[PDB]
């Protein structure tokens, strides 16, 4: 019984790890979106100053 409890717990921990990895991808690309989008805001800002 314990030999199989261990397999279910290992499965649960891996299901969390692949989730943690995917969360880092979301963190990274969203940071990239801020850089490109704030550039867009500066361009519109430049447009109105002119």
């Amino acid at each position: 019984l314990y030999y199989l409890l261990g397999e279910r717990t290992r499965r649960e921990h891996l299901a969390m790890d692949m989730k943690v990895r995917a969360s880092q991808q979301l963190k990274k690309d969203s940071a990239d979106d801020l850089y490109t989008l704030t550039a867009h805001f500066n361009e519109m800002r430049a447009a109105k100053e002119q």
Binding site: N42, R45, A46, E49, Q50
Partner: protein, 419 residues
């Protein structure tokens, strides 16, 4: 006539200053033995500004830096009486380096600098190279700045200070030192040229394309900046601009004296003969945002003022259309209620090895990003009093850190206000 006294504090300050005197002594043609061997007679005329024994004062708290100074070349040229030097060592404790160990070394460093100050006739100012992360460099150097202003209030004062960055973080108590050091700098130094290792490592990666940038080359880059900024005193020009004239042209408000610096030209060994040396080309390297030596991208904000010190036989007409073009093209990146935000200067003597060089000093409003970048780390650590007892059990109390916080907070507020 016009005189500049040098003061080097801490391990970081000493190795930067060691490389500085190497470059200047080379420019003035003085050998590592201490005798003149130069060619031109323009160099002898303005060698009293720095000298032939240098007019420097090294100061620290560990013998290793002094031993490493006399070991290398141009280490036999310092006067052994100027090696004012403690013995115990603060060691990355601002309280120790500002209250405990400073309290007995400061009297002796002040005596030697006072003798070295009154030895000449008319001071232009002092020039201090130090850090903001270490203890014996930052704290002791900081107290020296405060003591000097009480004795010499009408003289200029330069501070080449490096700041800690979270990407390049040496010690754990970095924000505890940087915040307190700024709290004293904002009211004491005349102006500061902010440096940091992150931007320096970044410069040596992209532009210099060096494989292993040891501390020798970083100190070499900072040294080229310091040689370029005082060339106007040491050599005639078609338009002269000493230290005082740069300060009054760059600082619109009395608390806005933290500058970002760049240098041009900087090219890899491979692309060294594949390039041209023209004023427009140097300007595109000057105003590049990846060429500033701080971790604060100036294109995330506005410029207040900017200056460019040129060296070499140039046509002043070219200077003016380049400066006006950069102002009329990117008009949003510059402040609106000051027209013609650019100060310029020309000197006829280039650095040894180049035909035409330039030095950029930009007073931008992107500086509030790095100071907020620092206050974040400081805020979290201070809230639960981490590492606080190593400072508190020395004389420092809690309101001192709160006071430094308020000064950090209202500085970035007025940068935002003037933005």
């Amino acid at each position: 006539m016009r005189e500049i006294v040098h003061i080097q504090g801490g391990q970081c300050g000493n190795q930067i200053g060691a490389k500085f005197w190497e470059v200047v002594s080379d420019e003035h043609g003085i050998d590592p033995t201490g005798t003149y061997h130069g060619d031109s007679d323009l160099q002898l005329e303005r060698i009293n500004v720095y000298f032939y024994v240098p007019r420097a004062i090294l100061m620290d708290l560990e013998p290793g830096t002094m031993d490493s100074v006399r070991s290398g070349p141009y280490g036999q040229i310092f006067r052994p009486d100027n090696f004012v030097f403690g013995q115990t060592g603060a060691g990355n404790n601002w309280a120790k380096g500002h209250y405990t160990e400073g309290a007995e070394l400061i009297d002796s460093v002040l005596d030697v600098v006072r003798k070295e100050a009154e030895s000449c006739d008319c001071l232009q100012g002092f020039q201090v190279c130090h850090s903001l992360g270490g203890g014996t460099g930052s704290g002791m150097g900081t107290l020296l700045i405060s003591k000097i202003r009480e004795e010499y209030p009408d003289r200029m004062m330069l501070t080449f200070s490096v700041v800690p960055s979270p990407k390049v973080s040496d010690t754990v108590v970095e924000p505890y030192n940087a915040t307190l050091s700024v709290h004293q700098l904002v009211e004491n130094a005349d102006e500061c040229m902010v440096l940091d290792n992150e931007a320096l490592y970044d410069i040596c990666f992209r532009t210099l394309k060096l494989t292993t940038p040891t501390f020798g080359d970083l100190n070499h880059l900072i040294s080229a900046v310091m040689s370029g900024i005082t060339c106007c005193l040491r050599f005639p020009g078609q338009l002269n601009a000493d230290l005082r004239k740069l300060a009054v042209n760059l600082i619109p408000f009395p608390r806005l004296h933290f500058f970002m610096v760049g240098f041009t030209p900087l090219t890899s060994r491979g692309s060294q003969q594949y390039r041209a040396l023209t004023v427009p080309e140097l300007t595109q390297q000057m105003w590049d945002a990846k060429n500033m030596m701080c971790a604060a991208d100036p294109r995330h904000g506005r410029y207040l003022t900017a200056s460019a010190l040129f060296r070499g036989r140039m046509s002043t007409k070219e200077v003016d259309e380049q400066m006006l073009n950069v102002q009329n093209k990117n008009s949003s990146y510059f402040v609106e209620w000051i027209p013609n935000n650019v100060k310029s200067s020309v000197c006829d003597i280039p650095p040894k090895g180049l035909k035409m060089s330039a030095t950029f000093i930009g007073n931008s409003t992107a500086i509030q990003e790095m100071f907020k970048r620092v206050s974040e780390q400081f805020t979290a650590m201070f809230r639960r009093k981490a590492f606080l007892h190593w400072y508190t059990g020395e004389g420092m109390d809690e309101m001192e850190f709160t006071e430094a916080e308020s000064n950090m907070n209202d500085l970035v507020s007025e940068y935002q206000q003037y933005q």
